[PDB]
């Protein structure tokens, strides 16, 4: 729902994120975490299904925050994917991926994964990056990287229920660091354009490595709505690599 | 911690485990679950920690449930990776992967993943999967798939904090589904052996695919035992390939 989305939610930790959902699907604001290497407010864009079933699931959504504003660059980017559920009660649960640029070596240590829950009440590389990339599914991913680090674009999935463009957002390290490390990123997809509605939403999140054999290399979350009997089974996760060259 | 694990567990969902912390840091029991296409009693098997560090850190650990009893076969394997931490509220907090056994076109929607946190106090043999694997990092997995569903072996890797072999144990599906589906399984790994202990656990949840290339696709979470500050940050996640082929 777009008016119950909209405001500010607090998790378990004391963070707090203010978030405006846009009527399109858009979701804008800010993030300020009470953990890690974190201070003040970072930008946060992600999407989320503007028609939601009303069997009574939730609202499929996620989003992305790179860890770099004015005052710190941790070179890491967070995406949490899950599903509001409105009510007395609102809720959003998540899921999340925090992937921090790394050497190739250390990359297989690159990605943290834990859960959030959000509640109402308050508790007690442009240029290498922009551009078509492409999946070892076959599908297709279209991005313009911005200089302050927005991501935004349209991703063609070769696989699920899906078909043809869906509207991506999200985020990069904009400085990255200049020891060879990878490009922390993440970026959301709601599975709803004008000719399908899947019901879900999916984040990646991961890190580009540039050179003569350009990679993104990421983890994925995908959420659906479910109904609260049956969110235990709404995330499905899995990995996916992309590359510039068009694969056979 | 052998004291403080073994015994009666409960999660949210009122699923129910009872496990026993050998002195070696196997974990053997059995899991009833609460919630999906579960009924009665499953088999579970792990690994946990047993010279945990005394920072005041949780003990890394994890276990294996193969859906597979006397009264169903669900063609899957949930694989927990956590922490516990004693005390007066003492809690097992987790992180799962539940993997289907799936055909190739559906494997990309194979595995669920999910959080479980446990608490002492109820709320109100495959020819095919036996031998050598290795992974696209170039360590080394020797399993031993029993009839009944249990697998054993040891664990060489390549990357990390860790060095020559580790105790493995986990449950696969010994009764897949014919219609071309992978076999799915899990296993784990605690890092400790008599030159290292890094304080962690690593369990892989995936499935087997047989052939001309049989492969093992897995997913897998590493927990560290952390303080009750760093828990947030104490779980990595990635994926891993195993071939039969070094």
């Known amino acids: 729902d777009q008016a119950g989305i909209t405001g500010t939610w607090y998790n378990q930790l004391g963070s707090t994120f203010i978030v405006t959902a846009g009527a399109d699907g858009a979701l804008t604001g800010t993030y300020e975490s009470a ?3 974190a201070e003040s407010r970072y930008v946060l864009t992600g999407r989320y299904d503007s028609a939601p079933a009303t069997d009574g699931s939730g609202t499929a ?11 710190r660059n941790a070179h890491s980017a967070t995406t949490w994917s899950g599903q509001y559920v409105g009510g007395a009660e ?3 649960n998540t899921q999340w991926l925090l992937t921090s640029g790394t050497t190739e070596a250390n990359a297989w240590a690159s990605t943290l994964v834990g859960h959030d829950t959000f509640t109402k009440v308050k508790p007690s590389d442009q240029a290498g990056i922009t551009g078509t990339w492409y999946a070892q599914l076959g599908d297709t991913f279209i991005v313009t990287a911005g200089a302050d680090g927005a991501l935004t674009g349209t991703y063609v999935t070769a696989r699920g229920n899906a078909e043809s463009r869906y509207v991506l957002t999200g985020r990069y390290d904009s400085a990255p660091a200049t020891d060879g490390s990878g490009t922390a990123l993440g970026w959301t ?22 050179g003569a ?24 996760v899995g990995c996916a690599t992309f590359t510039k060259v068009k694969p056979s």
């Open 189 to 210: 997809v709601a599975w709803k354009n004008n000719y399908r509605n899947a019901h879900s939403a999916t984040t990646w999140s991961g890190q580009y490595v540039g």
């Open 90 to 92: 609102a809720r959003i």
């Open 35 to 37: 953990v890690g290497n």
């Open 61 to 71: 959504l996620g989003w992305t925050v790179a860890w770099k504003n004015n005052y």
């Open 213 to 236: 054999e350009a990679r993104i290399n990421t983890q994925w979350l995908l959420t659906r709505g479910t109904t609260e009997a049956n969110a235990w089974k709404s995330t499905l």
